[PDB]
Amino acid sequence: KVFGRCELAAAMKRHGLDNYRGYSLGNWVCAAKFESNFNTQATNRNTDGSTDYGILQINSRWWCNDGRTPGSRNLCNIPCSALLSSDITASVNCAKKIVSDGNGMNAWVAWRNRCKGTDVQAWIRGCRL
Ligand SMILES: [Cl-]
Ligand SMILES: [Cl-]
Ligand code: NA
Numbered sequence: 684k685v686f687g688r689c690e691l692a693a694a695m696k697r698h699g700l701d702n703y704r705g706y707s708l709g710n711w712v713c714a715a716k717f718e719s720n721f722n723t724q725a726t727n728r729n730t731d732g733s734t735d736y737g738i739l740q741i742n743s744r745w746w747c748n749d750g751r752t753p754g755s756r757n758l759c760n761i762p763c764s765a766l767l768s769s770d771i772t773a774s775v776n777c778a779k780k781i782v783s784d785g786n787g788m789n790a791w792v793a794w795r796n797r798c799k800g801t802d803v804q805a806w807i808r809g810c811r812l
Pocket of ligand 3: 707708709710749803804805
């Protein structure tokens, strides 16, 4: 599923991400835009052999099991394919664990390079929330 901007904002609110660990909703919408272009099906292979999955590009070395990343830790205890669903619950639940690990949203490269320090509230402007 390719979400619209405001539709995704509403879904992430319904799932408790607004101000989760102090990150306002716009931060999460901005991260999703630049990680996946709001597409739940997005996948991208990395040089180390791991793969990133879904709307928030969650990595198969640490967070989910894809059966082809040797030494994977599977800290979210889920198959990576579950992160590609039109239902974002599994992605949100795993993201909550990632953002709590100590580095906050700096775990998402695109957030640090394209969202951090910008006017992220623009990503929710106009939306009925
Ligand atoms: Cl959803
Ligand atoms: Cl933080
Ligand atoms: Na915001």
